[PDB]
Amino acid sequence: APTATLQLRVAEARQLNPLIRMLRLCAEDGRALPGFAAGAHIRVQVSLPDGRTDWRHYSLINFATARNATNAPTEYVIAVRKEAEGRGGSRFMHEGLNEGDTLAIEAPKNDFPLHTGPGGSVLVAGGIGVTPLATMAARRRAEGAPVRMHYAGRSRELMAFLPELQALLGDDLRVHADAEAGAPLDIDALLDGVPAGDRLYVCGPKVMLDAVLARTQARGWEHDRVHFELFTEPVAEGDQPFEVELAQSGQRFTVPAGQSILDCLIEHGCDPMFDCKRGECGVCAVPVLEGEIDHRDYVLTAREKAQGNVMQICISRAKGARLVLD
């Protein structure tokens, strides 16, 4: 049940700007690490402010355009945005980790892969959400495949990897900075510009991913045309408690405000199906017999959400005070 881990050394730390720190991680003896495909992340072990150990996802970064670029890597590269008001994990990555330190990680996992079907690729990055999309861009360039990146942030001063991405993509990089535009990214115009059949890869904050989801579902885009990678944690936000009644056996649990339905069930004892835990994979779907749902996933169709008979319990909640689940 414990997940396999690697003990890596911090081979380089680089302050890209005041908020974002690049870390290069190597095996102790420089041997090859598990390979990965564009979109993969690693989970890294952090110490929280009270000394509790926990795990944090960070996407793997590569700009090299050799076709073998990430098949047998000898390093993993990540970039961490410091959240001074977060839970302490990103703070640890900035303040409690030094060059030469060792760090336990879990082997790469990929919930956000590039699609090999027909069509080019349009990448939509919000802030530090650029990290797996940079690797995606590098891979499409390695393939000679059409790719465009929309990279949006509040200020250019705080957006990482602009010189690397400009060199990699040239005119196929479109940078949006709120501080220059005076307005947020125009997602409607972005979607209008996507070439017919091209697939969309959206990574970053919940508010951006939600705006893309609403519009691509309104447009009736095919379900495998749009791909989502949600960085925002915790997914259990402002949220309220609610009752869950398990219809098979009458048990009524109270889901607290800071806990997902899935985590509440996993805790109390059941064996739910799950994987990504952030609304992307679809695996945790449960039928809903009664109660209005506040849907927060990126996998159910507009029709499925409207019918009200299924939800992703890793991320979605009750609209009211009670849900009856099968």
Ligand X SMILES: Cc1cc2nc3c(=O)[nH]c(=O)nc-3n(C[C@H](O)[C@H](O)[C@H](O)COP(=O)(O)O)c2cc1C
* Residue list, annotated binding site for FMN: 56-57, 59, 79, 81, 87, 89-90, 131, 233
Residue 299 as a binder of ligand FES (CB under 6 A): the answer is: yes
Task: CB nearer to ligand X: give 23 or 244.
Answer: 23
Closest contact distance (angstroms) between CB of 44 and ligand X is 9
Which residue, 119 or 127, is less far from ligand X as judged by CB?
A: 127
Bridge partner residues of 12 (DSSP): 24
Please report how close the Cβ of residue 93 comes to ligand X at its closest, in angstroms: 7
Among 70, 76, 81, 262, binds ligand X (CB under 6 A): 81
**Amino acid at the residue 247:** A
Residue 283 structure tokens: 């695996």
Which is closer to ligand X, CB of 104 or CB of 246?
Answer: 104
Residues annotated within a binding site: 56-57, 59, 79, 81, 87, 89-90, 131, 233, 275-277, 281-282, 284, 312, 314
Minimal distance in Å, beta carbon 78 to ligand X?
A: 6
d(C-alpha 94, C-alpha 2), whole Å: 26
| 67 vs 268, beta carbon nearer ligand FES | 268
Of 260-289, binders to ligand FES (CB under 6 A) are 274-277, 279-284
Sheet with 252-255, side-by-side order of all strands: 252-255, 242-246, 322-325, 285-290, 310-312
43's contact among ligand FES, ligand X, none, with CB below 5 to 8 A by partner kind, is none
Which residue's entry shows tokens 């380089």?
12
> Per CB under 6 A, does 90 bind ligand FES?
no
CB of residue 194 to ligand FES, shortest distance in Å: 25
- d(CA 88, CA 231) in angstroms, rounded, equals 15
Give φ, ψ of 137 to 5 degrees.
Answer: -60, -45
From ligand X, ligand FES, none, interface partner of 62 (C-beta below 5 to 8 A by class): none
Q: Is 312 in the site for ligand X (CB under 6 A)?
A: no
Nearer to ligand FES, 21 or 295 (CB): 295
Residues that bind ligand FES (CB under 6 A): 274-277, 279-284, 297, 299, 312, 314
Point out which residues bind ligand X (CB under 6 A): 41, 56-59, 78-81, 83, 86-91, 128, 131, 229, 231, 233, 278
